[PDB]
Symmetry: D2
Subunit: 116 residues, 4 copies
């Protein structure tokens, strides 16, 4: 699993289940191409979004639907969403893990770049 | 000042200076349309973006150019940029303070929403 | 001024009002002895803890009573309290600014040291 | 195991390897009595800190040595160390992952209590 997304709820202190995460990849036209899509499992992580061969070089946008997650719980959050825009595989084949900590009025995101 | 962005460097433990900040107010045709622009002062705070008269009930995008701040220092950051997207003033004249803590492979943004 | 302390609430998106704060400097006996106390204001801070003359070089510890804060709102937080142990005025006189973003199960604390 | 720990370097975007970890347990006579200890693995995880029998109801403190981690890298951190004081196993038997994101002048910790 080259690309991975890990999401947590800071209010309840557990994994953020069913959070719609959308992965786009840039284009020469500078428009966004829909690379992948999925929702986070009961563990709060969405692995198996892409494969080594398919995850080529480029700029990717990982967009997390935080507003929908909260609205479901009955809370109206600040952000409409939270996205992580980065340049992947520039140097070489690296395995990424994107983690995000959620709160109504704050969100935190860290990455963990690792060799295969 | 109903909208002020605050940015702090978490590696050197000081305010992030000269960080480019771009604000975009969503237009009626659903296109991100330029609202404000500026660079964080020496205190890390960027003020004087707009006024309440022209800070209408919409969806704004405060984009902080973190990539260039870090590259200037000689470091190579993970994120292309940090982006906060939210629906402002959808009730009444609220004052919005949006702050962000920066780290090369991590960052988090909080929002303090008050009113005079 | 030398020991400034802001405390935010990442759930309600506002400053944390009346959050107890206890500071302790390390005594020559390696035990923790009292130094200053007070509660955060409406703006979410306490600016009158000590003054240069009393804020000598040593090992300090700002303890923030997070437990009691979250217990009033009805919530049952994970931590008993947020602590920040650090060495003060090592490089001569400096002005410190501790800060914590509070959330039920997760807290974050940044430190900003500026020179007079 | 029932008590797992995680440290993550956010300056380099990698797991924090060889970080000292010391767990304490609230004694009966209100003093910090040693409970368990170890060092983080290649993945940044520290497992087998305690059995599913020693971890009885009490007030545990997890001290993560931040100071030496940064010193070794040439960096001059702000904090002497990260601490996580919490109450465990009062609602019954629980699993506790305790994460920490590090930066020279800022650290963040989150708890993920899972139910067996
Ligand atoms: N392989 C790892 C996966 C893992 C990573 C993080 I990172 C995490 O929790 C946090 C803590 C903080 I602090 C953050 O800012 C964010 I985003 C997520 C959790 I739970 C699990 C393991 O399970 O051991
Ligand atoms: N040096 C400042 C103090 C200060 C620093 C930060 I950085 C900050 O904003 C955040 C945002 C997030 I997201 C965090 O996780 C944290 I911790 C702090 C705020 I408000 C105040 C002064 O005295 O002016």
């Amino acid at each position: 699993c080259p690309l991975m997304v890990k999401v947590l709820d800071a209010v309840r202190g557990s994994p953020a289940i069913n959070v719609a995460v959308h992965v786009f990849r840039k284009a020469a036209d500078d428009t966004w191409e829909p690379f992948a899509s999925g929702k986070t499992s009961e563990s709060g992580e969405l692995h198996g979004l892409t494969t080594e061969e398919e995850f080529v070089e480029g700029i990717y946008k990982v967009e997390i639907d935080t507003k929908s997650y909260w609205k479901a719980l009955g809370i109206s959050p600040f952000h409409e969403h939270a996205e992580v825009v980065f340049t992947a595989n520039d140097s070489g084949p690296r395995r990424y893990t994107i983690a995000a900590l959620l709160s109504p009025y704050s969100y935190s995101t860290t990455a963990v770049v690792t060799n295969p």
